[PDB]
Design a protein around this ligand. Structure first.
Ligand code: CHL
Ligand code: CLA
Ligand code: CLA
Ligand code: CLA
Ligand code: CLA
Ligand code: CLA
Ligand code: CLA
Ligand code: CLA
Ligand SMILES: CC1=C(/C=C/C(C)=C/C=C/C(C)=C/C=C/C=C(C)/C=C/C=C(C)/C=C/C2=C(C)C(=O)[C@@H](O)CC2(C)C)C(C)(C)C[C@H](O)C1=O
Ligand SMILES: CC1=C(/C=C/C(C)=C/C=C/C(C)=C/C=C/C=C(C)/C=C/C=C(C)/C=C/C2=C(C)CCCC2(C)C)C(C)(C)CCC1
Ligand SMILES: CC(=O)/C=C/C=C(C)/C=C\[C@H]1[C@H](C)CCCC1(C)C
Lengths: 103, 60, 73, 163, 222, 195, 126
């Protein structure tokens, strides 16, 4: 439990919780309305792109709210990015000689 | 439709599209472009008259 | 993977509600995606502008050692 | 812009002195009272008056010793340079709107004639002179046409090519 | 019509019934009726401003010439009033901007919709002040406290207002030009003209006829 | 409830709205979906501004300093205190907690499909039942919008005054009261830049 | 009677208590403004004669006469009250113009009616 452990783990946990409980409905209905990528009124796989088939692992999860593996990677990536931003800004502001503030 | 009534040309490829000309005569024998229209300006070929269908002119 | 934006829907969504741009960007995904000449025109406009940016920035902010002293180069 | 007033610019003074010296060097080959001597002395007098007038107008001078004009309306009004570009802008725009309004009025008046093209190459000179005199009040009339909606022809009455 | 500005000319028909009309519109500025209404209001507003200004210049100058008062001359009265003014310059400008924004917007709204500043609920209970008269440029109410617009000399008073207004407008521009050309006040200019009218006029002030544009001035002299 | 510009023609789409004085000279409300979104936005801005101006004035009136100096412990190495009592958090914890809480509240608010409830939700947000009667509720909507508009203008005044003169709001009020004709926006060197 | 004998008074003013027909600018031409300005005159006059919860309950009732009077004595009150507001404005103006109190200036007027008044001091006339 160091400062790195605290900031990275707390940011990741907060991001995963925000994606699981708060923004899951918003993300879900935006991804529903935007839908699959299209070309000329058809999805890419219907148009003949076999490599564009939806990955079968990505939907079914066993989480009761439907939080799947892809959600975990996305929200954990956001959490790691936020935690490293905090750690880097703190590292800059604690190093003598560096002062990014506008006053 | 009437003789000497102003009409607006609706044919897009016409030089006088959206402009107003004067009906010279309307052929009554069922030809494809019966409305003869005279214009105050010449087109690029120096011509001032052209024939139009009924749906190609609008009475103004 | 079930996440990410769909460009056709982004373009279809960006129409000002006051009607100032008519139908907006509706249908432009298929217009761009089906026309190699639209894509090449966009690519050439952007790349050529970037080439000019390279010219304007390499003389004033020379990135290579002993380049600024080499006047001919 | 780091410039200096021309009345205190050393390059400005050097340019005046050098131009006068060249004209005076040309002068010492003619008798006094001759036409070349009088012409050269008149040119010298005009040169001295020009340099004095450009110094007295508050013009700014560069390192070249030459007057540089200020054209931002803010910098001109606060620092006394409105006579360089801003007042000429107003004067030009007034005369240009006069010329354009007189031309438009003549064209509109000729449009109602039986032979409208005849007035375009055989000028109705009394009508043209009358319309030209009335162009002095162009901004009032043009602004009224703009608010009334009669300045512009409607888009449905103008020919366009197929798109 | 009050007359013809140029006897024998054809006067425009749209100026036949306006008060103070002499058929004078050679530039045809008032040919459009909406423009004519706006210009009637503008001429009245300019007339009343110039009227009050020329009064506030001439009457102090006349009383100064008579030895009554010794108020400062008009082109320097801004300096002398500002030093003794309790309110500083910037606050005076801001207050003037606020007050004139308010009153000119009310006047403008009445111009666009006549009688609309006097309707019920328009002002905060005091809308009866500003009922208007249905006449462009003649508000009344508070602005006519003695009710003299309801008398039978109203039409002649409109004509008196416009002609005195035009005279005052010309007079103020004369005040400004005379100061810029001579550097003295208007009563001093009049007394100098009265002392020698042939030699003391605009042809000798050194500004109205520029010497470069008029080379005969330096030639045809004793 | 009146006319912002008496004697002027007012837009017909504004007729009947709570707090309507016919003010839309730029025609931003001519689109109905935009008008409904703008109504929600004006109400949210009004309520945030009323709470914010009340906090900025009352925290100062309790000796805790003006609104500008409240966060500067986070940049001067100080510590947060509420009414003198020390608060046991750092700035990053405050940001995380505020983000989580406000994001949850605004995500719950955004989900409401009903147009009336997106503006006037009621229910658990009206535990005292002022929305029981319509005639009280309608005039309270006008009261809410007018108070909120005043608070929005007040907060922008706080910001602009502190930018121009560098003083707190109560100090600016004291300075104006000591010399009204000589200490105002016109006498700073900022608001009218050409004197 | 009439504030100006010979002037024709407006018809909306006739019948009101204390109506001498004085409304040159027609501020009371509408009943809504005339009813509210009747309350304002009475409240101003009552405060001048004598010189939140009380003022809120003043307009809580929905009646018309109770906001004003919650026929001879009404005219008596209105003629006395108007003199009181004139007197208070005179007090403010005189203390602004001479710097003295309202009672000693009465003695100054009595001791010199022709050499000490609003004309002589350099405030009311510059
Ligand atoms: C008609 C207005 C007007 C005019 C012609 C003048 C003219 C003059 N003033 Mg005065 N002033 C005027 C209004 C005012 N002045 C002053 C306060 C002073 C001071 C303190 C001093 C002067 C002095 C002077 C003289 C100095 C010359 C100068 O600086 O050019 C100014 C030229 C102008 C034409 C005046 C300003 C421009 C314009 C007329 C203002 C009004 C335009 C409208 C606001 C436009 C509104 C647009 C609408 C459509 C929204 C000059 C004779 C001074 C001088 O004599 O030095 C010894 C001096 O010391 N003025 C105030 C108080 C804020 C005014 C309020 O309106
Ligand atoms: C209100 C009208 C009016 C009157 C009565 C005067 C009177 C005078 N002016 Mg001013 N003046 C006016 C308006 C007026 N001016 C205007 C509009 C301008 C700007 C062009 C001037 C610019 C001016 C200058 C630069 C000078 C005078 C000077 C004079 C003096 C006469 C000699 C002269 O040069 O005439 C001025 C000549 C003009 C051509 C201006 C005429 C303008 C008016 C409006 C013409 C209409 C007159 C009218 C038909 C009859 C007037 C009758 C009267 C009872 C109103 C005299 C004190 C001189 C001076 O100050 O004293 C020695 C002088 O140097 N005037
Ligand atoms: C898909 C890849 C992946 C996965 C599944 C994880 C998962 C994890 N990371 Mg991150 N990591 C990754 C990519 C990944 N990481 C990459 C690419 C880097 C290089 C930048 C890191 C560098 C990194 C650091 C430096 C840390 C983690 C930590 C963690 C743990 C946080 C668990 C927690 O809830 O804290 C519990 C929080 C509290 C109890 C408070 C968790 C095991 C943190 C951890 O190990 O300890 C907290 C930690 O400090 N990772
Ligand atoms: C007051 C509120 C407000 C404001 C100011 C705007 C402003 C804007 N919105 Mg709207 N919007 C609003 C409310 C608002 N919005 C609301 C409540 C919603 C619902 C959520 C939207 C939803 C919305 C969508 C979905 C879109 C916009 C878009 C736009 C933009 C273009 C609108 C338009 O019609 O352009 C009119 C433009 C023209 C008619 C063309 C003008 C071309 C000029 C004349 C060319 C000049 C070239 C020049 C001469 C050459 C170079 C100059 C040289 C000096 C360099 C603009 C930034 C669009 C966009 O652009 O988003 C970024 C868009 O897709 N809005
Ligand atoms: C092409 C348009 C253009 C550009 C690029 C500028 C540029 C500038 N102006 Mg000018 N200006 C313009 C058109 C322009 N002006 C027009 C059309 C007007 C009349 C409305 C002005 C009237 C004006 C004033 C009154 C002032 C400027 C000032 C300035 C400067 C700072 C402005 C700023 O944004 O500060 C942030 C800057 C050099 C300022 C200056 O004078 O000093 C820095 C200033 O006070 N401008
Ligand atoms: C009645 C005269 C008149 C008017 C009001 C206009 C107005 C306009 N011109 Mg057109 N033009 C004219 C005559 C006129 N033009 C003539 C005679 C020519 C042939 C040389 C052109 C060739 C021309 C081109 C090639 C272009 C314009 C464009 C424009 C527009 C922008 C302004 C401009 O670019 O000026 C520039 C004007 C010129 C370069 C030519 C002006 C020549 C003189 C000064 C004007 C004619 C005066 C006329 C003889 C007066 C007779 C009146 C008298 C009998 C009473 C504007 C709609 C531009 C555009 O369309 O903008 C959107 C544009 O690209 N003009
Ligand atoms: C257009 C109308 C106008 C304008 C802009 C002025 C402007 C001015 N007057 Mg004039 N005045 C006017 C009409 C006007 N006056 C009229 C119609 C008369 C009657 C003849 C006067 C008689 C007059 C006198 C007797 C004096 C002024 C003075 C002044 C100055 C100070 C005013 C002041 O301190 O406000 C005070 C604001 C109040 C509301 C009072 C100022 C330059 C004074 C001056 O010359 O120097 C200080 C001064 O003593 N004016
Ligand atoms: C929009 C609402 C809002 C916001 C964002 C703030 C924000 C702030 N207030 Mg503030 N407040 C508000 C409304 C608000 N106030 C209202 C309506 C009042 C009563 C008038 C106060 C009375 C108040 C006092 C007395 C103090 C603050 C202080 C603070 C700061 C620390 C907050 C804290 O530790 O609380 C913790 C809250 C809970 C644990 C619950 C912070 C700048 C403190 C200070 O540090 O700055 C002046 C402080 O002493 N507030
Ligand atoms: C407590 C407090 C803080 C918080 C303060 C808050 C929370 C403030 C909220 C402010 C708001 C929400 C202001 C809104 C402020 C919003 C404002 C001023 C909005 C103005 C908009 C206007 C005037 C628009 C007008 C138009 C309309 C209406 C039309 O109709 C068009 O046609 C024409 C046109 C003119 C464009 C702190 C964190 C700082 C810390 C301090 O220590 C304390
Ligand atoms: C099962 C379960 C659960 C859960 C838990 C867990 C198990 C979780 C985990 C999760 C996690 C733990 C996740 C994580 C993730 C992460 C991630 C995915 C990451 C990523 C990263 C990144 C992306 C990074 C990047 C970068 C780099 C590399 C460099 C620098 C910059 C940056 C930072 C950007 C619970 C209890 C609730 C319930 C019951 C059951
Ligand atoms: C300042 C600038 O950037 C653009 C201004 C020009 C206008 C308003 C264009 C013309 C209008 C007029 C009123 C009728 C024709 C079409 C328009 C667009 C409505």
């Amino acid at each position: 439990l160091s400062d790195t452990n605290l900031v990275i783990g707390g940011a990741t946990v907060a991001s995963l919780a925000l994606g699981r409980f708060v923004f899951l409905g918003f993300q879900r209905d935006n991804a529903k309305k935007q839908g699959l990528p299209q070309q000329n009124g058809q999805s890419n796989v219907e148009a003949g792109d076999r490599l564009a088939e939806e990955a079968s692992f990505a939907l079914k999860t066993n989480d009761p709210a439907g939080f799947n593996l892809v959600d975990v990677m996305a929200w954990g990536a956001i959490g790691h990015a936020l935690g490293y931003f905090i750690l880097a800004t703190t590292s800059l502001n604690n190093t003598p000689g560096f002062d990014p503030k506008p006053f | 439709r009437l003789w000497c009534v102003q009409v607006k040309v609706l044919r897009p490829e016409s030089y006088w599209f959206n402009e107003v000309g004067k009906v010279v005569s309307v052929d009554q024998s069922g030809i494809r472009y019966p409305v003869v229209v005279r214009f105050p300006t010449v087109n690029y070929a120096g011509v001032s008259t052209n024939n139009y269908s009924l749906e190609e002119v609008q009475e103004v | 993977f079930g996440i990410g934006h769909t460009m056709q829907e982004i373009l279809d969504a960006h129409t000002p509600p006051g009607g100032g741009l008519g139908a907006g960007h509706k249908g432009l995904f298929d217009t761009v995606n089906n026309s190699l000449h639209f894509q090449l025109g966009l690519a050439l406009a952007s790349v050529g502008t970037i080439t000019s940016l390279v010219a304007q920035h390499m003389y004033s902010l020379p990135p290579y050692a002993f380049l600024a002293q080499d006047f001919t180069t | 812009s780091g410039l200096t007033p021309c009345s205190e610019s050393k390059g400005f003074a050097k340019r005046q002195k050098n131009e006068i010296k060249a004209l005076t060097k040309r002068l010492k080959q003619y008798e006094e009272g001759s036409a070349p001597s009088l012409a050269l002395k008149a040119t010298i007098e005009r040169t001295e008056k020009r340099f004095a007038n450009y110094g007295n107008a508050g013009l700014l001078c560069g390192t070249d010793g030459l007057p540089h004009l200020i054209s931002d309306p803010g910098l001109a009004l606060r620092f006394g340079h409105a006579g360089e570009t801003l007042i000429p802008t107003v004067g030009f725009l007034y005369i240009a709107g006069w010329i354009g309004t007189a031309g438009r009025d003549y064209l509109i008046a000729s449009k109602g004639e039986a032979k409208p093209r005849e007035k375009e190459y055989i000028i109705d000179v009394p009508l043209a002179l009358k319309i030209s005199a009335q162009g002095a009040g162009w901004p009032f009339r043009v602004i009224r046409e703009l608010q009334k909606g009669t300045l512009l022809e409607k888009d449905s009455n103008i020919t366009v090519s197929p798109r | 019509k009050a007359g013809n500005w140029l006897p024998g000319s054809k006067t425009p028909a749209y100026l036949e019934d306006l008060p103070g009309s002499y058929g004078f519109d050679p530039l045809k500025l008032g040919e459009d009726p909406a423009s004519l209404k706006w210009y009637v209001q503008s001429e009245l507003v300019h007339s009343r401003f110039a009227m009050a200004a020329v009064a506030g210049i001439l009457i102090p100058e006349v009383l100064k010439a008579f030895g009554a008062v010794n108020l400062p001359v008009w082109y320097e009265a801004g300096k002398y009033a500002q030093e003794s003014s309790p309110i500083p310059f910037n606050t005076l400008i801001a207050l003037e901007i606020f007050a004139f924004n308010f009153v000119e917007i009310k006047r403008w709204q009445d111009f666009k919709k006549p009688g609309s500043q006097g309707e019920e609920g328009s002002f905060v209970g005091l809308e009866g002040f500003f009922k208007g008269t249905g006449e462009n440029g003649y508000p009344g109410g508070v602005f006519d406290p003695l009710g003299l617009s309801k008398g039978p000399g109203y039409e002649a008073m409109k004509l008196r207002e416009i002609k005195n207004g035009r005279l005052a407008m010309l007079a103020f521009i004369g005040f400004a030009s005379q100061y810029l050309a001579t550097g003295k006040g208007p009563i001093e200019n009049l007394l100098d003209h009265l002392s020698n009218p042939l030699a003391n006029n605009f042809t000798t002030n050194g500004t109205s006829l520029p010497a470069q544009a008029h080379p005969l001035l330096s030639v045809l002299k004793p | 409830a009146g006319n912002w510009l008496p004697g002027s023609d007012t837009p017909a789409y504004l007729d009947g709205l709570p707090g309507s004085f016919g003010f839309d000279p730029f025609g931003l409300g001519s689109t109905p979906a935009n008008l409904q979104r703008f109504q929600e936005a004006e109400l949210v801005h009004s309520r945030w501004a009323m709470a914010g101006v009340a906090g900025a004035l009352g925290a100062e009136l309790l000796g805790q300093g003006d609104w500008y100096q409240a966060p500067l412990w986070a940049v001067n190495g100080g510590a947060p205190t509420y009414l003198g009592i020390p608060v046991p958090f750092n700035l990053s914890t405050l940001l995380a907690i505020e983000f989580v809480a406000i994001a949850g509240a605004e995500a719950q608010r955004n989900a409401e499909p009903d147009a009336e409830k997106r503006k006037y939700p009621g229910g658990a947000f009206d535990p005292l039942g002022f929305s029981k009667d319509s005639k009280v509720l309608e005039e309270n909507k006008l009261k809410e919008l007018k108070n909120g508009r005043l608070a929005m203008l007040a907060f922008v005044g706080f910001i602009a005054q502190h930018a121009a003169t560098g003083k707190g709001p109560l100090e600016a009020l004291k300075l104006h009261l000591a010399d009204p004709w000589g200490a105002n926006f016109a006498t700073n060197g900022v608001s009218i830049p050409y004197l």
